[PDB]
Each structure stands twice: as C-alpha cells, then as structure tokens.
Amino acid sequence: ISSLWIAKTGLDAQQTNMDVIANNLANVSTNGFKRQRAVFEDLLYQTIRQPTLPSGLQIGTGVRPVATERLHSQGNLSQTNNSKDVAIKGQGFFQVMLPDGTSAYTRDGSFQVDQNGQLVTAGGFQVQPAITIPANALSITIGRDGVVSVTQQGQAAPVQVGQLNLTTFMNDTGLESIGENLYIETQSSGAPNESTPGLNGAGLLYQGYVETSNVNVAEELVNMIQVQRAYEINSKAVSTTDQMLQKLTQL
Amino acid sequence: MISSLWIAKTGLDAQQTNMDVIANNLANVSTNGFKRQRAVFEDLLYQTIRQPGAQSSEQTTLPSGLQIGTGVRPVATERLHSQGNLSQTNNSKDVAIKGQGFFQVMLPDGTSAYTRDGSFQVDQNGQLVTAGGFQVQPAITIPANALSITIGRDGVVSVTQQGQAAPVQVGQLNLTTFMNDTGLESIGENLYIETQSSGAPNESTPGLNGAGLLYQGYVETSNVNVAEELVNMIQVQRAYEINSKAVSTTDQMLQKLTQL
Amino acid sequence: ISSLWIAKTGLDAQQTNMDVIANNLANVSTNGFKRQRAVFEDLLYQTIRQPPSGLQIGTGVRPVATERLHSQGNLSQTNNSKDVAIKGQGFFQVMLPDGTSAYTRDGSFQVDQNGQLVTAGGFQVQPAITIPANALSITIGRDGVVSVTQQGQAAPVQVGQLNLTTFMNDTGLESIGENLYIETQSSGAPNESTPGLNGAGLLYQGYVETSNVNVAEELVNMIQVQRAYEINSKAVSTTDQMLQKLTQL
Amino acid sequence: NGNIQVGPTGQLTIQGHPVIGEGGPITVPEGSEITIAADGTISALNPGDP
C-alpha cells in the first residue's frame, strides 16, 4: 500500500545518507579530499480535491535525494617534509592532463617526477603547464607565487624552470568527480580561469606541505547515530504497514 | 550487500595499509640508509546518478548533481630520499654519503643493485663487500699486506702497505644517480634495482655531475622522524576505530532490516 | 514451488562462502598458507517466450570456483637453522611416501635419523640432501646451496642444492592437505629451477613465510555472510507463508 | 507508465508503440545516458564526452 512505498523511499534516503557518511569517513587521510553532504527533497504531493477551506488536504509521498554538495573549504595542512609536495592556500586547482588529452583538475599536492622529469601526480598524470626538472637537480624551490626553480651543482643561482599555474572556477561545487582525486569541467562549473597563484582570486602555494581532507569525524559519527535511528524508525513504519495489511487480508 | 559496507571495507583496508607502512618505518629505525616511506591515497569510482550538468528546465541548469562515490584505494607509496643525519662511527670501513648518489653493487646473478649503505667489509679475496658478500662496482681489492685503509672525499681508496712509506691507490669508488631516486624498486638487503620509472643510471665519481661526497668514519642514519611516526600511529588507530564503527553501524542497519 | 529452491541455492552459496572464510581464519598462523576465495556464478535462465523478444526469470546461484591468492606472505623470524622461507615465486618439491611428488611452500624443515632433510611429517625433500653425522652449523644461501661446517675444518663442505619449482599456473594446483600441492592438468608441468634464476624466488634462512590471510577482510566478510544468510532465510519464510495462504483455499 | 526504454536504434519507448513528444516519436542518439527534466526536456550525453 501507499504507506509501504513511502516508507521504502524513506529507507532509501537514509541509506544514501549512510553511503555519503561512509565515503566521507573512509576518505579521511586522503589528501585534498572535500567533504560531501546529501541534500534531500520531498516527492510529489497528492491533492485530494474537496467537494473557504483554510487548508487543503495533501497526502504527500516519500522523499528523494536531490543532490550531493561538496564543501569546498580550506583543509588543515600537514608537514610532509617532502620537496615535491605542495599545498594551496585558498581557492584553486592544479590542472592535469589525462592520457586521452582531456584536462582534469586536482587539488592534490603529492607530486613526483618520472624518468623524463615531468612533474607527475602519483598515478603518472602530467601536470599542466608542463614542468621538466633537469637531470641532476640538487633541490626544488616553489615560491608562494608558484614559480618553480632548481639549483644545479656548480651554479650559484636558481635556474628558473617553470611556472605552476592554478585554475579557479565559478562554481567549484558543481564539478564532477571522476575518482583518483580528479575533477572535470561541467556545464554547471563554467569555464576555468588559468591564473598565477596569489592573484585574481587564486590561492598561494606552500612547499613541503600537503592539504589534509576537511572531513569532520565527530560530525560524521553523530550523523551515523542519526542515520541508524532514522533507518530503524522507517523500518518500524514498514513493519507496522505489513501488520496492517496482514489483518486486512485475514478478514 | 550494501553500498555502505563495501565503502567501509575499503576504508578499513586503506587504514590497514597505512598502518603497515607506519610499522615498517618504525621497525627500521637504526637501520643505515633507510628511507622513510609514506602512503598516498586516492578515492575510487563515483557512481553518477544525476549528471552535474544536464540542464533541468529549458533554462535552469541543475548545479552539482547527485554522485555517491566509493572506496579509498591506496595509489602509491612515495619514499623520501632526503639526506640522513650522519653519525660519527669512527670506523675505518664505514663510509657515508652526503648528497645524491648510490653505491653500485654486483648481485651474484650478474645484475646490478644500488645501496646507500657504506657499512662495508673486506672478505677473503680482499674485495669490498657489504654485509652479505655483495661485491661492489667497480671491484676494489685490498692487498693482503695492507695495514690501514682510507677513502678520500673524492672516492679514491688507497691503503698503507707495510714498509712502503706511501698510500698507494688501490681503487676508485664511484656513485650513480637516477633522475628519479624515488622510482627505484627495493628488493631488501638495503638494495634497490633499476626500473622503468627511475630511468637510466648515470655513473660518476663522487662530487662530479650531481653526485654527493663520501665521508669515511661516518654512517648515514635512517631519516625516520620518531614523533611523526608516533602521531601517525595515533591518528591511524583512531581512523581504524572510526571505520570499524561505520561497519558496525551498517551491520545494525542491515540486521534491523532482517528482523523486519 | 519455485522461489523456495532458488532461495535455497542462495543459502547454499552463502554457506560455501562461510566455509571458505572459516578455513581461512582457522589456518591463520600456518606457515605458507594461501588464503582461498570463493567465486560464485549464477545458474541457468528460464526464458519466458513473448508471443525485446522474451524475458528471463533465472534460478539461483552456484559456486563455480575457489582461487588461491599466491601472493608473498610476511616473514617471521624463528632462529631455526633449518627453517627456510621463499622470496617470490616457487615451491619446494617433496616426495610422497608412495613415490610420487608433491609441492609445498612451507619451509619448516627437519632432519630425520639418517640426516635426510624432511618436512614435519617425514616426506623427503628433493633433491636428496643429507646432513653429515657430525654437523656443527648448517647454512643455506640465497642461491639454495646448502652446506655444513665440520669440526675444525675451516671450510664449508657443500652438501646439497635445494632447488625450487615454478608452475605456469600457481592457482591450478590442487591441495591434498598437509600443506602439500600436486600437479594437475590445469597447472602444466613443473619447471625445476635453481632459486633466483628464471623467475624462481630466493631463499631466506632462519625465516618462515606466514599465511597471507587478512583477518579484517574476513571479519567484514563474516558480517556480509551472516546478513546474507538471514536475508535468504527471510525470502524462504516469505515463500513458505505464501504457500500457507495458497493451500488454505 | 513512465518506465521509458531506449532501443538500439535510439527510439524512446514506453512499452513498444513508442512515446510522442513535441511532434512525432522522439529519437535520441545511441549513446543515451539520458536525463529527463523537471518539465520534460530530454538531454543526452555520449558516454565518453566531456
């Protein structure tokens, strides 16, 4: 009956809530991960048209998960004590080049250099614009302005080797996540703005630090308690409807 | 079973791998030349339900649609190849390195490995070996009547013969550099082998062409930060705590569904 | 009735999964044990013919295989001069009492009363390696050459070579218990090689390889298995009550 | 019955005898990934496109 299916919708809503909470809680300690929250939304409302009338009667059905919005706030820093790694102060992303040629955007700083010296990101993806470290680089220096340089043995000056540009978005909430700590542009995100860090609303760069995920674990645990209780409540509704229908079909 | 439980299982596995790495770091303090290792994680699939674009009305746009996501797949372990803190061992066979560079060693199978460990030894035939008879490259054979050995800052290894009032030069000890030190594949024994990621090896005497310098009488310590490892261990235990909490919560949900 | 049998096949599949999990969890702390995983498969499909061009109802599930995970287990230090573990691929070859050959990735070796190297149960390793009667120290190098040290003789007499054997298919082997595998037609002929060459692994002396069983995986798996069992029992009860209401009239 | 289906040719069908919208029967590309609006507009993404 109608009660059974609206209670099913409630159960599905709570289950998707728990899925979001679980992905949040598992992805703690994932660098640059952004917490996610599910926004729900009630379904159609049945109008029982009456034969004045300060309020009509509407039965209403269930609930639907309408969105998951990612909180794109600033995460705490972690001292990786690694020259390659870099962190972002404020808005912005590092653009990376996928194997197929389409560009993705990651706000992750765990960079490396491969055999060809390209600054790649833990999975081989080449950052953009390309930076090629020379063969015997003694050190790598990344200023807060993003310009990256190296110091060569025998030379008393940092030979500038590249510029590490950030990318800002109109609505970075609306980006689509494709796993691998990568996001890609969508109709809802608008065109990217490829800008020098520290300018035009972009963030700055920290060398030797990596941004931790902004997942608040206490909030997640309290949300888990809510989800468990709500699931048990809706299961009670399902059971009550089942008993009601039992007594109906008995007669 | 439930989308929740697989996600929580991936989270537990990720925390377990992270604890494995922390334990390997913590056990390898007081190992010469060991490089601290750290795990880099990576989120899995995202099951898209409503496309984040996909204009809803003829005008509206539906910003930030519904996508769920799973998993915490650990993508890599980077190895921090920073200079260890040298220690005054005052030993005549123990040599440390200052800067980039690896000793090359001939494995008995005929292939070459690379070690940042100068805790050397001299065997029957006079060779410089390294705690297991792994003969270095290029070979260095001490004369049987040599008395004391010295290794200059430039790798020139020479001995004092008996009666001879001169340090005759016996061998030359050169290093090797990889344009990606991190991409080496460790095989135990404090040894690394060349892979495609590290790139070709450039062998040169110390000092020249980016290599470091050689310090006799010193040994390189493991660059393991004890306090960092301890706080990592606390944080990992609590993350495992919480993920098992999520597993149990999903269990309770499912069980209440069963007795329905 | 129909749903009853298909739900029973579900129950049987979950029971097989729990049997595999129990065997994994029980053989923890067995040197060289390879954890087993059950791969299930759905049964045939009934096709209701439409006068798309039809629909399929399907029936139950069937356990189709169990694969063994032939990864490398953690080493454990035992201070025993005879225990040996393997770095990488390869198996020790042993000779069953009847005369045929089994293969074990378990290196808790001993010497019997005649000096032969046997394996905790008395099966002779191959090739025959016999320790001299007055041995002081036994050494087994990474290359498998086992040698002993006699009294005062300041030179190790080479006494054997402890080869490994590698298979084209590690998983195809059937286990006959007692930490022993024997070649099957799915595994291909053994490739007998010295350690460290041609793909075989090295040997570590004084260490035994442990089981590659992940207990967190198995506890979560047991959660899943118990919940699935209860769910399938719920389906069985539902069908049973439907048959109540059917026969009441 | 809103249980819409896509055929191999890309013809939207609530159970065959297909659906009618803004003219005759609606057709979508083979790579559907269809999303339907809050007011009916049907948008499609070829499953390997930006």
Side-chain angles (χ1 to χ4, degrees), chain B residues 4-54:
Chain B
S4 303
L5 205 57
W6 305 112
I7 298 173
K9 188 173 181 178
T10 56
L12 282 168
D13 270 0
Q15 283 323 295
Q16 179 51 236
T17 291
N18 205 247
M19 181 55 218
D20 276 357
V21 175
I22 288 159
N24 181 56
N25 285 6
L26 271 195
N28 264 297
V29 292
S30 79
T31 288
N32 286 349
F34 182 76
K35 297 323 207 183
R36 187 269 290 154
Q37 211 186 10
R38 185 196 82 104
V40 182
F41 293 102
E42 178 268 331
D43 62 358
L44 273 177
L45 278 185
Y46 273 78
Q47 308 175 359
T48 63
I49 297 184
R50 320 182 64 194
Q51 183 72 40

Short mmCIF file of all heavy atoms in Angstrom, two decimals, chain B residues 4-54:
data_model
loop_
_atom_site.label_atom_id
_atom_site.label_comp_id
_atom_site.label_asym_id
_atom_site.label_seq_id
_atom_site.Cartn_x
_atom_site.Cartn_y
_atom_site.Cartn_z
N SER B 4 27.10 0.81 1.55
CA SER B 4 27.83 1.32 2.71
C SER B 4 28.95 0.38 3.12
O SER B 4 30.05 0.83 3.47
CB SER B 4 26.87 1.53 3.87
OG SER B 4 25.82 2.40 3.52
N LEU B 5 28.69 -0.92 3.11
CA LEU B 5 29.63 -1.86 3.70
C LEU B 5 30.88 -2.03 2.85
O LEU B 5 31.98 -2.16 3.38
CB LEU B 5 28.95 -3.20 3.93
CG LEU B 5 29.61 -4.02 5.04
CD1 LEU B 5 29.62 -3.21 6.30
CD2 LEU B 5 28.84 -5.29 5.25
N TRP B 6 30.74 -2.03 1.52
CA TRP B 6 31.92 -2.11 0.68
C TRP B 6 32.80 -0.88 0.88
O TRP B 6 34.03 -0.99 0.94
CB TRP B 6 31.53 -2.26 -0.78
CG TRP B 6 30.62 -3.43 -1.09
CD1 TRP B 6 29.33 -3.36 -1.50
CD2 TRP B 6 30.95 -4.82 -1.02
NE1 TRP B 6 28.83 -4.62 -1.68
CE2 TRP B 6 29.80 -5.53 -1.39
CE3 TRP B 6 32.10 -5.53 -0.67
CZ2 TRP B 6 29.77 -6.91 -1.43
CZ3 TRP B 6 32.06 -6.90 -0.71
CH2 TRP B 6 30.91 -7.58 -1.09
N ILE B 7 32.19 0.29 0.99
CA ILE B 7 32.94 1.52 1.20
C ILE B 7 33.70 1.46 2.52
O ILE B 7 34.88 1.80 2.59
CB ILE B 7 32.00 2.73 1.17
CG1 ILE B 7 31.32 2.86 -0.18
CG2 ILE B 7 32.76 3.98 1.46
CD1 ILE B 7 30.27 3.93 -0.21
N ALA B 8 33.02 1.02 3.57
CA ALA B 8 33.69 0.91 4.86
C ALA B 8 34.80 -0.13 4.82
O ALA B 8 35.83 0.04 5.48
CB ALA B 8 32.68 0.57 5.95
N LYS B 9 34.62 -1.20 4.05
CA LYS B 9 35.66 -2.20 3.91
C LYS B 9 36.90 -1.62 3.24
O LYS B 9 38.03 -1.89 3.66
CB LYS B 9 35.12 -3.39 3.12
CG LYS B 9 36.04 -4.58 3.06
CD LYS B 9 35.33 -5.74 2.41
CE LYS B 9 36.21 -6.96 2.36
NZ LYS B 9 35.49 -8.13 1.77
N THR B 10 36.70 -0.82 2.20
CA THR B 10 37.83 -0.16 1.56
C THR B 10 38.52 0.78 2.53
O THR B 10 39.75 0.88 2.53
CB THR B 10 37.38 0.62 0.34
OG1 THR B 10 36.36 1.54 0.73
CG2 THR B 10 36.82 -0.31 -0.70
N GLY B 11 37.75 1.49 3.35
CA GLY B 11 38.37 2.36 4.33
C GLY B 11 39.21 1.61 5.34
O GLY B 11 40.32 2.04 5.68
N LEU B 12 38.70 0.49 5.84
CA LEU B 12 39.49 -0.33 6.76
C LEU B 12 40.76 -0.82 6.10
O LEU B 12 41.83 -0.81 6.72
CB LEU B 12 38.67 -1.52 7.26
CG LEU B 12 37.64 -1.30 8.35
CD1 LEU B 12 36.78 -2.53 8.46
CD2 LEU B 12 38.32 -1.01 9.65
N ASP B 13 40.67 -1.27 4.85
CA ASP B 13 41.85 -1.77 4.17
C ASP B 13 42.88 -0.67 3.97
O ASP B 13 44.08 -0.90 4.10
CB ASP B 13 41.46 -2.39 2.84
CG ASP B 13 41.14 -3.86 2.95
OD1 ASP B 13 41.21 -4.40 4.07
OD2 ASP B 13 40.81 -4.48 1.92
N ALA B 14 42.42 0.54 3.65
CA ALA B 14 43.34 1.66 3.49
C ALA B 14 44.05 1.99 4.79
O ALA B 14 45.26 2.19 4.82
CB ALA B 14 42.60 2.88 2.96
N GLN B 15 43.30 2.05 5.90
CA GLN B 15 43.94 2.30 7.18
C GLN B 15 44.90 1.18 7.55
O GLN B 15 45.93 1.43 8.19
CB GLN B 15 42.90 2.48 8.27
CG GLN B 15 42.21 3.82 8.28
CD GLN B 15 43.13 4.95 7.93
OE1 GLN B 15 44.06 5.25 8.65
NE2 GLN B 15 42.86 5.60 6.81
N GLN B 16 44.59 -0.05 7.16
CA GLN B 16 45.49 -1.16 7.45
C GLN B 16 46.78 -1.06 6.67
O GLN B 16 47.86 -1.31 7.21
CB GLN B 16 44.80 -2.49 7.15
CG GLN B 16 45.68 -3.67 7.41
CD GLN B 16 46.29 -3.63 8.78
OE1 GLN B 16 47.51 -3.68 8.93
NE2 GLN B 16 45.45 -3.54 9.79
N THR B 17 46.70 -0.70 5.39
CA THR B 17 47.92 -0.48 4.62
C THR B 17 48.73 0.67 5.20
O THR B 17 49.97 0.60 5.26
CB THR B 17 47.58 -0.21 3.16
OG1 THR B 17 47.07 -1.41 2.56
CG2 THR B 17 48.79 0.26 2.40
N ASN B 18 48.05 1.73 5.62
CA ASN B 18 48.75 2.88 6.19
C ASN B 18 49.47 2.48 7.47
O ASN B 18 50.61 2.89 7.71
CB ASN B 18 47.74 4.00 6.43
CG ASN B 18 48.38 5.35 6.44
OD1 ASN B 18 48.42 6.01 7.48
ND2 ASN B 18 48.92 5.76 5.32
N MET B 19 48.83 1.65 8.29
CA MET B 19 49.48 1.15 9.50
C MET B 19 50.63 0.21 9.17
O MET B 19 51.62 0.17 9.90
CB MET B 19 48.47 0.43 10.39
CG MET B 19 49.05 -0.09 11.68
SD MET B 19 49.86 1.20 12.63
CE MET B 19 51.26 0.31 13.30
N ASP B 20 50.51 -0.56 8.09
CA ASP B 20 51.62 -1.40 7.65
C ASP B 20 52.84 -0.54 7.34
O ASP B 20 53.96 -0.87 7.73
CB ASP B 20 51.22 -2.20 6.42
CG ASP B 20 50.49 -3.48 6.75
OD1 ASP B 20 50.32 -3.79 7.95
OD2 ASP B 20 50.06 -4.17 5.81
N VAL B 21 52.63 0.55 6.62
CA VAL B 21 53.73 1.44 6.26
C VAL B 21 54.33 2.09 7.49
O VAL B 21 55.56 2.20 7.62
CB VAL B 21 53.27 2.49 5.23
CG1 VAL B 21 54.37 3.47 4.97
CG2 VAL B 21 52.87 1.81 3.95
N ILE B 22 53.49 2.52 8.43
CA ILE B 22 54.00 3.12 9.65
C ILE B 22 54.81 2.12 10.45
O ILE B 22 55.85 2.45 11.03
CB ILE B 22 52.85 3.70 10.49
CG1 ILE B 22 52.31 4.95 9.82
CG2 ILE B 22 53.32 4.03 11.87
CD1 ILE B 22 50.93 5.28 10.25
N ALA B 23 54.35 0.87 10.51
CA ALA B 23 55.08 -0.15 11.25
C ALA B 23 56.41 -0.46 10.59
O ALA B 23 57.41 -0.69 11.28
CB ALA B 23 54.25 -1.42 11.37
N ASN B 24 56.45 -0.49 9.26
CA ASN B 24 57.73 -0.72 8.58
C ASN B 24 58.69 0.43 8.82
O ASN B 24 59.90 0.21 8.96
CB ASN B 24 57.51 -0.94 7.09
CG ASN B 24 58.79 -1.20 6.35
OD1 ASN B 24 59.53 -2.13 6.68
ND2 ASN B 24 59.07 -0.40 5.33
N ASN B 25 58.19 1.66 8.86
CA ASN B 25 59.05 2.78 9.22
C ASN B 25 59.56 2.65 10.64
O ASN B 25 60.75 2.84 10.90
CB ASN B 25 58.29 4.09 9.06
CG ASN B 25 58.14 4.50 7.64
OD1 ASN B 25 58.50 3.76 6.73
ND2 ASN B 25 57.58 5.68 7.42
N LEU B 26 58.67 2.33 11.57
CA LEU B 26 59.02 2.32 12.98
C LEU B 26 59.96 1.19 13.32
O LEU B 26 60.76 1.31 14.25
CB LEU B 26 57.76 2.21 13.84
CG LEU B 26 57.18 3.57 14.17
CD1 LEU B 26 56.18 3.46 15.28
CD2 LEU B 26 58.31 4.47 14.54
N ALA B 27 59.87 0.09 12.61
CA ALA B 27 60.79 -1.00 12.84
C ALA B 27 62.17 -0.71 12.28
O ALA B 27 63.16 -1.19 12.83
CB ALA B 27 60.21 -2.28 12.24
N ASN B 28 62.26 0.10 11.23
CA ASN B 28 63.51 0.35 10.54
C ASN B 28 64.21 1.61 11.02
O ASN B 28 64.99 2.19 10.27
CB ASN B 28 63.28 0.45 9.04
CG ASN B 28 63.54 -0.85 8.35
OD1 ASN B 28 64.66 -1.35 8.35
ND2 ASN B 28 62.51 -1.41 7.74
N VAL B 29 63.95 2.06 12.25
CA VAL B 29 64.89 2.97 12.86
C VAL B 29 66.18 2.23 13.14
O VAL B 29 66.22 1.00 13.23
CB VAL B 29 64.31 3.60 14.14
CG1 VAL B 29 63.18 4.52 13.80
CG2 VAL B 29 63.84 2.52 15.07
N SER B 30 67.27 2.97 13.24
CA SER B 30 68.59 2.40 13.48
C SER B 30 69.02 1.44 12.39
O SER B 30 69.86 0.57 12.62
CB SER B 30 68.66 1.70 14.84
OG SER B 30 68.06 0.43 14.76
N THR B 31 68.44 1.55 11.20
CA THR B 31 68.94 0.89 10.01
C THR B 31 69.60 1.93 9.12
O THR B 31 69.01 2.96 8.83
CB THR B 31 67.82 0.19 9.24
OG1 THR B 31 67.39 -0.97 9.97
CG2 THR B 31 68.29 -0.24 7.88
N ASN B 32 70.84 1.66 8.72
CA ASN B 32 71.60 2.65 7.98
C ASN B 32 71.00 2.86 6.60
O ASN B 32 70.69 1.91 5.89
CB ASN B 32 73.05 2.20 7.85
CG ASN B 32 73.81 2.33 9.15
OD1 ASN B 32 73.33 2.94 10.10
ND2 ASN B 32 75.01 1.77 9.19
N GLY B 33 70.83 4.13 6.23
CA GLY B 33 70.43 4.48 4.89
C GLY B 33 68.99 4.22 4.55
O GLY B 33 68.60 4.42 3.39
N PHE B 34 68.17 3.80 5.50
CA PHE B 34 66.77 3.54 5.21
C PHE B 34 66.05 4.85 4.93
O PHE B 34 66.32 5.87 5.56
CB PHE B 34 66.12 2.81 6.38
CG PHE B 34 64.69 2.47 6.14
CD1 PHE B 34 64.35 1.43 5.32
CD2 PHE B 34 63.69 3.19 6.74
CE1 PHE B 34 63.04 1.11 5.10
CE2 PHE B 34 62.37 2.88 6.52
CZ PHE B 34 62.05 1.84 5.70
N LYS B 35 65.12 4.81 3.99
CA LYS B 35 64.38 5.99 3.57
C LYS B 35 62.94 5.88 4.04
O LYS B 35 62.26 4.90 3.73
CB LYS B 35 64.42 6.15 2.05
CG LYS B 35 65.81 6.38 1.47
CD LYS B 35 66.67 7.25 2.36
CE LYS B 35 67.71 7.98 1.55
NZ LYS B 35 68.61 8.79 2.41
N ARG B 36 62.49 6.88 4.79
CA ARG B 36 61.12 6.90 5.28
C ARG B 36 60.14 6.76 4.13
O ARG B 36 60.32 7.36 3.07
CB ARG B 36 60.86 8.20 6.03
CG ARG B 36 59.54 8.28 6.73
CD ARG B 36 58.49 8.89 5.83
NE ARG B 36 58.68 10.31 5.58
CZ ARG B 36 58.24 10.93 4.49
NH1 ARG B 36 57.62 10.25 3.54
NH2 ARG B 36 58.43 12.23 4.35
N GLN B 37 59.10 5.97 4.34
CA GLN B 37 58.13 5.67 3.30
C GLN B 37 56.76 6.16 3.75
O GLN B 37 56.43 6.08 4.94
CB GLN B 37 58.09 4.18 3.02
CG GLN B 37 57.73 3.83 1.61
CD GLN B 37 57.56 2.35 1.43
OE1 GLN B 37 57.54 1.59 2.39
NE2 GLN B 37 57.44 1.92 0.18
N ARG B 38 55.97 6.66 2.81
CA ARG B 38 54.68 7.23 3.18
C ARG B 38 53.67 6.95 2.09
O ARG B 38 53.98 7.07 0.90
CB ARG B 38 54.82 8.73 3.42
CG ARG B 38 53.57 9.42 3.91
CD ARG B 38 53.72 10.91 3.73
NE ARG B 38 53.41 11.33 2.37
CZ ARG B 38 52.29 11.93 2.00
NH1 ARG B 38 51.35 12.18 2.90
NH2 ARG B 38 52.10 12.27 0.74
N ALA B 39 52.46 6.60 2.50
CA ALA B 39 51.41 6.18 1.58
C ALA B 39 50.58 7.37 1.12
O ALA B 39 50.20 8.22 1.92
CB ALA B 39 50.51 5.13 2.23
N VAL B 40 50.30 7.40 -0.18
CA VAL B 40 49.46 8.41 -0.80
C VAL B 40 48.20 7.71 -1.28
O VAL B 40 48.27 6.73 -2.03
CB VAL B 40 50.17 9.10 -1.98
CG1 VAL B 40 49.28 10.16 -2.57
CG2 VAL B 40 51.48 9.69 -1.52
N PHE B 41 47.05 8.23 -0.85
CA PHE B 41 45.76 7.62 -1.08
C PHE B 41 45.00 8.34 -2.18
O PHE B 41 45.40 9.39 -2.68
CB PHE B 41 44.95 7.58 0.21
CG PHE B 41 45.52 6.67 1.24
CD1 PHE B 41 46.23 7.17 2.29
CD2 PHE B 41 45.35 5.32 1.14
CE1 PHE B 41 46.76 6.34 3.23
CE2 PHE B 41 45.88 4.49 2.07
CZ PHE B 41 46.59 4.99 3.11
N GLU B 42 43.86 7.76 -2.54
CA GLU B 42 43.20 8.03 -3.80
C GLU B 42 41.78 7.50 -3.78
O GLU B 42 41.57 6.31 -3.53
CB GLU B 42 44.05 7.42 -4.91
CG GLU B 42 43.55 7.54 -6.32
CD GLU B 42 42.71 6.34 -6.71
OE1 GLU B 42 42.95 5.24 -6.17
OE2 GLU B 42 41.80 6.48 -7.56
N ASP B 43 40.80 8.35 -4.04
CA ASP B 43 39.42 7.92 -3.97
C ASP B 43 39.00 7.18 -5.23
O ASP B 43 39.51 7.42 -6.32
CB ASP B 43 38.51 9.11 -3.68
CG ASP B 43 38.55 10.15 -4.76
OD1 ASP B 43 39.31 10.00 -5.73
OD2 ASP B 43 37.81 11.15 -4.64
N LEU B 44 38.07 6.25 -5.05
CA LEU B 44 37.67 5.30 -6.08
C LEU B 44 36.55 5.88 -6.94
O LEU B 44 36.35 7.10 -6.99
CB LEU B 44 37.25 3.97 -5.45
CG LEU B 44 38.33 2.95 -5.17
CD1 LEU B 44 37.75 1.75 -4.49
CD2 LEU B 44 38.97 2.55 -6.45
N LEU B 45 35.83 5.01 -7.65
CA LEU B 45 34.71 5.33 -8.51
C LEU B 45 33.75 6.34 -7.91
O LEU B 45 33.65 6.46 -6.69
CB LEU B 45 33.91 4.06 -8.79
CG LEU B 45 34.38 3.12 -9.87
CD1 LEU B 45 33.36 2.04 -10.03
CD2 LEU B 45 34.45 3.92 -11.11
N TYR B 46 33.04 7.07 -8.76
CA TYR B 46 31.90 7.87 -8.35
C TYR B 46 30.72 7.46 -9.21
O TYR B 46 30.71 7.73 -10.41
CB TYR B 46 32.19 9.36 -8.47
CG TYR B 46 32.86 9.94 -7.25
CD1 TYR B 46 34.20 9.75 -7.03
CD2 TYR B 46 32.14 10.66 -6.32
CE1 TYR B 46 34.81 10.27 -5.92
CE2 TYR B 46 32.74 11.18 -5.21
CZ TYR B 46 34.08 10.99 -5.01
OH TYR B 46 34.68 11.51 -3.90
N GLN B 47 29.73 6.81 -8.61
CA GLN B 47 28.53 6.42 -9.32
C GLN B 47 27.68 7.66 -9.54
O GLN B 47 27.05 8.16 -8.61
CB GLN B 47 27.74 5.36 -8.55
CG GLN B 47 28.55 4.17 -8.12
CD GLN B 47 27.75 3.23 -7.26
OE1 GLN B 47 26.58 3.48 -6.97
NE2 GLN B 47 28.36 2.13 -6.84
N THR B 48 27.67 8.17 -10.76
CA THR B 48 26.89 9.35 -11.08
C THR B 48 25.43 8.96 -11.23
O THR B 48 25.11 8.02 -11.96
CB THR B 48 27.40 9.99 -12.36
OG1 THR B 48 27.23 9.07 -13.44
CG2 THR B 48 28.87 10.31 -12.23
N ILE B 49 24.54 9.66 -10.54
CA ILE B 49 23.12 9.40 -10.61
C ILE B 49 22.39 10.49 -11.38
O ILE B 49 21.62 10.19 -12.30
CB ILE B 49 22.53 9.21 -9.20
CG1 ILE B 49 23.17 7.99 -8.55
CG2 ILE B 49 21.04 9.06 -9.26
CD1 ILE B 49 22.61 7.66 -7.20
N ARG B 50 22.62 11.75 -11.04
CA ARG B 50 22.14 12.88 -11.84
C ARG B 50 23.35 13.64 -12.35
O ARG B 50 24.22 14.01 -11.57
CB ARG B 50 21.24 13.80 -11.02
CG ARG B 50 20.30 13.07 -10.12
CD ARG B 50 19.39 14.02 -9.38
NE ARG B 50 18.49 14.74 -10.27
CZ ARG B 50 17.80 15.81 -9.90
NH1 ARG B 50 17.90 16.27 -8.67
NH2 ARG B 50 17.01 16.42 -10.77
N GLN B 51 23.39 13.86 -13.65
CA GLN B 51 24.56 14.48 -14.25
C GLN B 51 24.70 15.92 -13.76
O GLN B 51 23.74 16.68 -13.82
CB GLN B 51 24.44 14.46 -15.77
CG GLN B 51 25.64 15.02 -16.45
CD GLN B 51 26.82 14.10 -16.33
OE1 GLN B 51 26.69 12.88 -16.43
NE2 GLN B 51 28.00 14.67 -16.12
N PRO B 52 25.87 16.32 -13.26
CA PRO B 52 26.01 17.67 -12.71
C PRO B 52 25.74 18.77 -13.72
O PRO B 52 25.44 19.90 -13.32
CB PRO B 52 27.47 17.70 -12.23
CG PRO B 52 27.78 16.29 -11.94
CD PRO B 52 27.06 15.49 -12.99
N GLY B 53 25.82 18.48 -15.01
CA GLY B 53 25.35 19.43 -15.99
C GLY B 53 23.88 19.20 -16.18
O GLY B 53 23.11 19.34 -15.23
N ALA B 54 23.46 18.86 -17.40
CA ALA B 54 22.13 18.32 -17.64
C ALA B 54 21.06 19.29 -17.16
O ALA B 54 20.37 19.06 -16.16
CB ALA B 54 21.97 16.94 -16.99
#
